[PDB]
Design a binder for this molecule. Structure first.
Ligand SMILES: C[C@@H]1C[C@H](O)[C@@]2(C)C(C(=O)O)=CCC[C@@H]2[C@@]1(C)CCc1ccoc1
Ligand SMILES: [Zn+2]
Length: 856
């Protein structure tokens, strides 16, 4: 019997309006049963209903028309197309156009052993008892694994969820609990209130023994944090942050949060960082739970930013949703950007605005490659859709929005946002909808923003100065007929006011009022472009950084460091001139230019570590330590100062210890010895813990001691610090053990496996083990994490993108091409191949130049 539908996309003439979802999960057998009742209307006659279903055993399907006395039921025959993840329901007669019908489906499934669908999560009590819970993760296409549905984001509907569970367990879902009814078999049926109209991917439900803490907003919304009983005392910070941020967004968008409550649940097993399910946001425990004594400043910042991200989605994603995954950036670019807007207001002591440009540089890494994609690009299958959750949708999306906001001004941008959110509330949007909204306040918005969303990559802006005449040229930046509307900014030696010039053409000229000593484009790195200066331009700017680096802001200094090294890669600046510029860092004090320096310089020796280059690698590492030696030496071994001072300290001490800087190694050995002799009871400053643990794990006794403390820790920061330290061992049997254990999920959870694999991929002796492990265990890793997931992308890049020989390039090409449909077409594979090709060319051109430069 042939399947009566040949497309991946569903027919668009059968529309759902409301779902009634009844779910019973048996935690003892890992089996679940459901009854789905979906109210539908057909716009054209059909005897066939096509919908999504994946790994669900359908026992019965019926078609209802009317209610009570005037009720009719009809049996529905079921056909399956597993590859398209569809089912076809066959009625004995055609459906009458425009009349409401209810499709009733009874089914069963097994709780997923992955991190998606309706899945199993476990933890151990401090007494060592194993506890099992069931949670959901549906974005993008996994709602169809928990209940049959029209599983595309434009098929919005209301949802009335009912959960049957044991009296000893708690169930939570998107909406408040309205009633709990005693049913047969000693079960309780929880009835949750009907949701607002929303996408299937936002449905959520959890059956657990979680504890909770709550606080009410000024608008009367009940905000709650849920977590395992042993960790609920770490919920207070996120609870306070969530209340403040929810109030900020309501005030800012002038659109109230529409639900009576908002829950934030810390899940013991979670693949991504968090998920924005409407009324039930979910998080990795490390992304939500703060320990005032053991958590790092970076973890505290991470929690604040993640809560800000998920809450921004309540408007940008939930209330207004992209029509299709090709426009995922409308959700992700906005939520990423709003983290910075919201936290800059709510937590001005975190100084987050100063860190934003770092996201743009992250996007530029991928976007400089031929294998990048436009922000808005076609996608069809689930693996392609998952590939949209990447630095282009998130970081480039946020960066082009930041660039647009600076161009329009914050108030005109805000008016545009509010108009957009109001007009498209409970509906779906495409790119043109956003431009139309922004332009209704912005005459050039549509033409300009189409250049930034429909073309991959970014421009190189070349500056040539002839007296008062500033010549500008744009061209597509490509590693080794594109045209943008570029909102340029600049400052000069005569004016620190931010000047604006819209470059709509290949070339243009601006006439300065008077001649200047220097000009610097892309003020504060607020623009998604790079800049090259002709003639003595780079010598001049190098001179400025070396004489009066304070003449330009910390972010302007970071932008110069980054652009100089990006220009080496396209042969516009020599490696010697970029390295000469980096020498100014001997007097740098600020976190962003110091970190930008490390971001450009560390990858160079990471390439050398994987080659026969011991001498140059050692001299390069010695140069790096000598360059930052005064700054390293000034660091106190405490938790004193601002969040930026704490993060700078932690990374400087770790860098010094990793590269065997003796004053820091001897001090770290001392703290470790003292900490170990006290049986880990003595408190170490959190800021020095990474360095201290990395040093301590270099001995068998130290590694074993760290591992013994890991099993009992309730702190996410401490566990992450121990995992990092353990992965830095140069004992291959211990590195193999870490890969084996985290892969199995026994002693170390599988949610840690992608980071562990990358850390070992970066280990100077362990890198062959990580690449070999990925190849050997590929199928099981794909089954666990999914083809196209950001996790698989990070595992691919993390084990191969630091290779720089033709032999390594063929190993990568050969391996991934052998996978056929199970990974040969992954975008991350094309990206890593292109990265290795660039590494080969860069090393062949510059290795000897660096060798000579280091001797001089
Ligand atoms: C992400 C890095 C990975 C890198 O493999 C690593 C582990 C490193 C090494 O392997 O040599 C030495 C210093 C720390 C560094 C980092 C964690 C931190 C870099 C850093 C800090 C501040 O700005 C950049
Ligand atoms: Zn998001």
């Amino acid at each position: 019997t042939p399947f009566p539908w040949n497309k991946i996309r569903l027919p668009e003439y059968v529309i759902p309006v409301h779902y009634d979802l009844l779910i019973h999960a048996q935690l003892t057998t890992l089996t679940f049963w459901g009854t789905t009742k979906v109210e539908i209307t057909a716009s054209q006659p059909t005897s066939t209903i096509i919908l999504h279903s994946h790994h669900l055993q359908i026992s019965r399907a019926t078609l209802r028309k009317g209610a009570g006395e005037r009720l009719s039921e009809e049996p529905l025959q079921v056909l399956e197309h597993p590859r398209q993840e569809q089912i076809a329901l066959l009625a004995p007669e055609p459906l009458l156009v425009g009349l409401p019908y209810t499709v009733v489906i009874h089914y069963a499934g097994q709780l997923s052993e992955t991190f998606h669908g309706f899945y199993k999560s476990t933890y151990r009590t401090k007494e060592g008892e194993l506890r099992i819970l069931a949670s959901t993760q549906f974005e993008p296409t996994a709602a169809r694994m928990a209940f049959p549905c029209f599983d595309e984001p434009a098929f919005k509907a209301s949802f009335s969820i009912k959960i049957r569970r044991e009296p000893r367990h708690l169930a939570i879902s998107n909406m408040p609990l309205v009633k709990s009814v005693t049913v047969a078999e000693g079960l309780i049926e929880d009835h949750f209130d009907v949701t607002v109209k929303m996408s299937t991917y936002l449905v959520a439900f959890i059956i657990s023994d979680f504890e909770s803490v709550s606080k009410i907003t000024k608008s009367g919304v009940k905000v709650s944090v849920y977590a395992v009983p042993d960790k609920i005392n770490q919920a207070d910070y996120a609870l306070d942050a969530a209340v403040t941020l929810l109030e900020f967004y309501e005030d800012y968008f002038s659109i109230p949060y529409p639900l009576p409550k908002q829950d934030l649940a810390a899940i013991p097993d979670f693949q991504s960082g968090a998920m924005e399910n409407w009324g039930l946001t979910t998080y990795r425990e490390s992304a939500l739970l703060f320990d005032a004594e053991k958590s790092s400043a970076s973890s505290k910042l991470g929690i604040t930013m993640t809560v800000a991200h998920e809450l921004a989605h309540q408007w940008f994603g939930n209330l207004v949703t992209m029509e299709w995954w090709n426009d995922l950036w409308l959700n992700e670019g906005f939520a990423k950007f709003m983290e910075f807007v919201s936290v800059s207001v709510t937590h001005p002591e975190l100084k987050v605005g100063d860190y934003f440009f770092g996201k743009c540089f992250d996007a530029m890494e991928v976007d400089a490659l031929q294998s990048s994609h436009p922000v808005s690009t076609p996608v069809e299958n689930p693996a392609q859709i998952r590939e949209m959750f990447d630095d282009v949708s998130y970081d480039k999306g946020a960066c082009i929005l930041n660039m647009l906001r600076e161009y329009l001004s914050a108030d005109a941008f805000k008016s545009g946002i509010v108009q957009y959110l109001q007009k498209h509330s409970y509906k779906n949007t495409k790119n043109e909808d956003l431009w139309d909204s922004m332009a209704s306040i912005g005459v050039d918005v549509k033409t300009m923003m189409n250049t930034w969303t429909l073309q991959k990559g970014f421009p190189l802006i070349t500056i040539t100065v002839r007296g008062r005449n500033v010549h500008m040229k744009q061209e597509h930046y490509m590693k080794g007929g594109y045209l943008w509307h570029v909102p340029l900014t600049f400052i000069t030696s005569k004016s620190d006011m931010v000047h604006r010039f819209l470059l709509k053409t290949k070339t243009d000229v601006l006439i300065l009022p008077e001649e200047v000593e220097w000009i610097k484009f892309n003020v504060g790195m607020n623009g998604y472009y790079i800049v090259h200066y002709e003639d003595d331009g780079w010598d001049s700017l190098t001179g400025l950084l070396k004489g009066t680096h304070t003449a330009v802001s910390s972010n302007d200094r970071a932008s110069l460091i980054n652009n100089a090294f990006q220009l080496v890669s396209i042969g516009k600046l020599s490696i010697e001139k970029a390295l000469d510029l980096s020498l100014y860092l001997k007097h740098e004090t600020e976190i962003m230019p110091v970190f930008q320096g490390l971001n450009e310089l560390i990858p160079m020796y990471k390439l050398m570590e994987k080659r026969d280059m011991n001498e140059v690698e050692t001299q390069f590492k010695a140069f790096l330590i000598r360059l930052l030696r005064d700054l390293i030496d000034k660091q106190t071994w405490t938790d004193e100062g601002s969040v930026s001072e704490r993060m700078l300290r932690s990374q400087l001490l770790l860098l010094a210890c990793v590269h065997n800087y003796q004053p820091c190694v001897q001090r770290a050995e001392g703290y470790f010895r003292k900490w170990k002799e006290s049986n880990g009871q003595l408190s170490l400053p959190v800021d020095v813990t990474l360095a201290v643990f990395a040093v301590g794990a270099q001995s068998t006794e130290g590694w074993d001691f760290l591992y013994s403390k890991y099993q009992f820790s309730l702190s996410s920061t401490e566990k992450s610090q121990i995992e990092f330290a353990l992965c830095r061992t140069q004992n291959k049997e211990k590195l193999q053990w870490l890969l084996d254990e985290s892969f199995k999920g026994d002693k170390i959870k599988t949610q840690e496996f992608p980071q562990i694999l990358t850390l070992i991929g970066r280990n100077p002796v362990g890198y062959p083990l990580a690449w070999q492990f990925l190849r050997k265990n590929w199928n099981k890793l794909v089954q666990k994490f999914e083809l196209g997931s950001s996790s698989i992308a990070h595992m691919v890049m993390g084990t191969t993108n630091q290779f720089s020989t033709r032999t390594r390039l063929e190993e990568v090409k050969g391996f991934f091409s052998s996978l056929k449909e199970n990974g040969s077409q992954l975008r991350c594979v094309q990206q890593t191949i292109e990265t290795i090709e660039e590494n080969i060319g860069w090393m062949d051109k510059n290795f000897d130049k660096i060798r000579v430069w280091l001797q001089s």
